[PDB]
Design a protein around this ligand. Structure first.
Ligand SMILES: [Cl-]
Ligand SMILES: [Cl-]
Ligand SMILES: [Cl-]
Ligand SMILES: [Cl-]
Ligand code: NA
Ligand SMILES: [Ru+3]
Ligand SMILES: [Ru+3]
Length: 129
């Protein structure tokens, strides 16, 4: 599923991401924009052989099981394919664990490079939230 911007903002809010760990909703929408272009089916291979999955590009090295990332963990206790669903529940629940890990949203390199320190409220501007 390719979400609309405001559609994704509303889903993320309903699932408790608004201000989770202090990160306003615009931060999460901005991260999703640059990680996946709002496409739940996005997958991308990393140089280390792991793969990133879903609207927040969650990495099989630590967070989900894809059966093909040697020596990895599955700290969200989910198959990576569950992160590709039209229903964002699994991605949100796993993102909550990731952002609590110590480095906040810096875990998402694209958030640090493209969202951090910008006017992230623009990503929810106009949305009926
Ligand atoms: Cl915001
Ligand atoms: Cl594996
Ligand atoms: Cl699995
Ligand atoms: Cl933080
Ligand atoms: Na894994
Ligand atoms: Ru839902
Ligand atoms: Ru850690």
């Amino acid at each position: 599923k390719v979400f609309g911007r405001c559609e994704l903002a509303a889903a993320m809010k309903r699932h408790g991401l608004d201000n989770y760990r202090g990160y306003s909703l615009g931060n999460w929408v901005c991260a999703a924009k640059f990680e996946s272009n709002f496409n739940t089916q996005a997958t991308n291979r990393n140089t280390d052989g792991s793969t990133d999955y879903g609207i927040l590009q969650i990495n099989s090295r630590w967070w989900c099981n894809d059966g093909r990332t040697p020596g990895s963990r599955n700290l969200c206790n989910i198959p990576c394919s569950a992160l590709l669903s039209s229903d964002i529940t699994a991605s949100v629940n796993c993102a909550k664990k990731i952002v609590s890990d110590g480095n906040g949203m810096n875990a998402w390199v694209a958030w640090r490079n493209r969202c951090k320190g910008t006017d992230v409220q623009a990503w929810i501007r106009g949305c009926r939230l």
